Amino acid sequence: TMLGEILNYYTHWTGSIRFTFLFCGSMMATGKLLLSYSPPGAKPPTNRKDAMLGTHIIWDLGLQSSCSMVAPWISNTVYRRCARDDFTEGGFITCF
Amino acid sequence: GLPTMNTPGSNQFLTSDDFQSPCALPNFDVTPPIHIPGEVKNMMELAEIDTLIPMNAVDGKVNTMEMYQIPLNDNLSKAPIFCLSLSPASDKRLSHTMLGEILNYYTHWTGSIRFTFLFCGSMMATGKLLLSYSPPGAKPPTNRKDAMLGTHIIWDLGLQSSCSMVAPWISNTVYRRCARDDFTEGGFITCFYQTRIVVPASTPTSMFMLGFVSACPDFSVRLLRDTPHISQSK
Amino acid sequence: GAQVSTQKTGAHENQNVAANGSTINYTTINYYKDSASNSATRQDLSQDPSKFTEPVKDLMLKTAPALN
Amino acid sequence: SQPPSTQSTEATSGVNSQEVPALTAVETGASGQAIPSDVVETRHVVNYKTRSESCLESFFGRAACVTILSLTNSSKSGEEKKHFNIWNITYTDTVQLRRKLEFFTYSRFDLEMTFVFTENYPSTASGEVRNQVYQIMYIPPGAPRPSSWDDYTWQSSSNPSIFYMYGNAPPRMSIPYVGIANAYSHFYDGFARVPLEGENTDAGDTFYGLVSINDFGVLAVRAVNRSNPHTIHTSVRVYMKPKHIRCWCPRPPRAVLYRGEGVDMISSAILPLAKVDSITTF
Amino acid sequence: GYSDRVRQITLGNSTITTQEAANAIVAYGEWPTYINDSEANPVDAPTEPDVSSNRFYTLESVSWKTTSRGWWWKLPDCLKDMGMFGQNMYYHYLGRSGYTIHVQCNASKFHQGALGVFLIPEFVMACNTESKTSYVSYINANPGERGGEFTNTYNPSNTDASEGRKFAALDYLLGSGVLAGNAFVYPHQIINLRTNNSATIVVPYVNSLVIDCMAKHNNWGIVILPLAPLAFAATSSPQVPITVTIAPMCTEFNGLRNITVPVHQ
Ligand SMILES: CCCCCCCCCCCCCC(=O)O
């Protein structure tokens, strides 16, 4: 992604990251989605109840077609390594 | 001592008496109050809450949840949708609403009554309903033609889901008896289609509405009586 | 140390004003010191029906759409 | 000054506007707010009526009969145990009082109690019996309770009591609010204790509700007279009038016949409404 | 400007948005608050989590079919294993909390039906036996997030001890002998499918005590009823989910002890 491509020129990064989801269905259709971020560690959020205990937003589909979920910068360091270095685990993002 | 005479009433026991009695537990330290949300000061505060009317309590509906659902259709009809007698502590279908039960503790009542109807059909369906009140001097507003000569509201089903009709305090007395009588005739309430409900393809053709009843701010009661609704064996 | 207070009016009271006549009065003396022994309290017509009839966070006026 | 009256009606006229009091959205949880001046033309009316009968203090200002106790003073030895009667204090013995109280979830009040006595002869033959006196003793929860009409606890060295001579005016006494909580609850959605993982899976079955938590003691009532050849049976009617009352949460009133001290239903009485012939009957 | 229908509720680490709500209700006009020193009962040093217990939790979803007669929950009970709210109610003898109750139910514009969402303080329900009164097991009385269901048949058993320990959850009498039509006295909101897809009710703690024991008493219950039937007209049997999402708020605890572990199945 553009964010990934810029960050691939760096060894370290920091700050919150936003994930925005645009629904592209019919106008007559409705529904709700759960967008969630869990800090790193423990087992991954493989079902809704566990995803739910993490940071999350419930997105109501309607005229506003785009919902922003923000993964706060929750970390045990100052900057995380860009590389998939186990010293700086990313956390998990899911949608249910 | 002071010479006195004992007047009539001495030594009787009256249910509604107001007279100081000695304390059973002198110097008892009473557990202090805290604020508890929801304080009620007057029964009329509850009389003003909109509650459901078991409008359809007919065979097969009586004492089931469906008694609160007034049917509506997309079919031709010149018939009334429902009818109600405006006698809150008498009409079988009105007597058990919150307003009805509070009034069953009173001998007389006054003020205006509000009837609120909520359409619980599809969003795609539309239509117009006529709600009306016809004071007692009238013959039963059987036809739409009779209903439209009384007090009435045309309710356009739309973006706002409900409509409130008020049956004003039109009376030949000040307060009407709560108990059924022939003299204190309630007046008639009914509803007709003003047009028809129009339902599109793949949309249900059988809709319901929920009617509610409540007291208006000018409402009041006169004298307390026991409710006829709850029995006890010996 | 008696407390005089206005009586509820009745059949022979000419005004519904309740501020006409020096005769619409009664005297209360509390004979017992334990407050539980006091006679029934005064009428208080303060009401706040909004707690049950309009407990809505966002104020809406009755003339405006209930839902904007 | 003058007690505040109910809503007066202003005069109004015809309306043609974008303001629409006729429509609302009851989905909001709010009731409709329409009054006659919003939907019809009205004339000016000064409203001098007040909601005084309907105030809670007025509503509950009646001494309801709650229970009836049976005392028997007899020379027959098998009746000794009947000379003395113990009443577990509750308002649940009578439907009108509990139903009115059950309009609310919680309440606080002081209580006035009145004791009305009636004597008769249950026997096939009457005769002279001297005037009887009755003792009403309140025994708080945990206090010693008598085994008989002539036991030691009747000395009333702690427990408050009333001695009433038959024929005088009924005794009347006032009890200050005595709940441990800051209001009496009329309902309790819970258990007296919490059964744990080391206990039976059906545990708690017998200790649910207001019934398992409240204990207001008992009324120990006895004739205080010695037995006579002609038996006297006494009916004691115990009345209650709550006063200085505040209530904190409205509830629907019970629609059906009560079965016991809880909220239990009897299937024979779960049909509270009468049938009508038609939705269109006036 | 802003619409009334569109809203955002943020608590702790969670947010709920909606584009179709009929405003929100604050029961009795009051917000959850912490106990004022002047009303405190215990003299223990209180625990006041800020963003641990005070987050939204999603309870297991239920399905709305045309044959359902309603659903119910006991409120503290439905959150008993919900992360930190769950752990704190078991570690502490006492606790108090208000709640934000949010009920969700989607439907298309071609669907009809309505759900009454009522919050009932002290939601005491009748036993299902005529041989005993106020009789119900701890376990059946407190089902957890699963909640329970309403029926339209009263089928008590005066001989079967097991069935008698379940609740007699009639829909029309709300499980306790009161006609449902008067349920509207309680704070409530209606998810009328042609108007709203959600409801929000703010709930203050309401009791005779400032604080009570959570493993013993359910301050509030949640009742959802099919006030109007579900219909789609493009199927013989329509179905939509109903999901209840709840957050504790202004939560406090006292009486720290060993973790309570209730009888369970
Ligand atoms: C000498 C006889 C005096 C008896 C005093 C008994 C006082 C009872 C207090 C009222 C308890 C019932 C209230 C409730 O159940 O919520």
List keywords for this structure.
part of a larger assembly, 5 chains, C: 68 residues, little secondary structure, 1 helix, D: 282 residues, 5-stranded antiparallel sheet, 4-stranded antiparallel sheet, 4 helices, 7% helix, binds myristic acid, Genome polyprotein (chain E), virus/immune system, polyclonal antibodies
Describe the structure.
The structure is cut from a larger assembly and holds two copies of chain A, one copy of chain C (68 residues), one copy of chain D (282 residues) and one copy of chain E (265 residues). Chain A has 96 residues and is mainly β. Chain A contains two helices and seven strands; from the N terminus they run H-E-E-E-H-E-E-E-E. Chain A has helices spanning 2-7, 48-52; strands at 12-13, 17-22, 32-38, 55-60, 66-71, 80-81, 92-95. The longest helix of chain A has 6 residues, at 2-7. Chain A is globular and about 45 Å long. Chain A starts with a helix and ends with a strand. Chain C has a two-stranded antiparallel ribbon. The N and C termini of chain C lie far apart (59 Å). The relative contact order of chain C is 0.16. Chain D is built from four helices and ten strands; from the N terminus they run βααββαβββββαββ. Chain A binds chain E through residues 28-32, 34, 48-49, 52-64, 67, and chain E through 6, 13-20, 55-58, 60, 82-83, 104, 106-109, 197-198, 243, 245. Strand 4 (55-60) of chain A pairs parallel with strand 2 (14-18) of chain E, so a sheet runs across the interface. The structure holds myristic acid. Myristic acid is lined by residues 89, 91, 111, 113, 136-138, 160-162, 175, 178, 184, 214, 216, 219 of chain D. Myristic acid (MYR) binds next to strand 4, strand 5 and strand 6 of chain D. Chain E: This is Genome polyprotein. Chain E: Belongs to the picornaviruses polyprotein family.
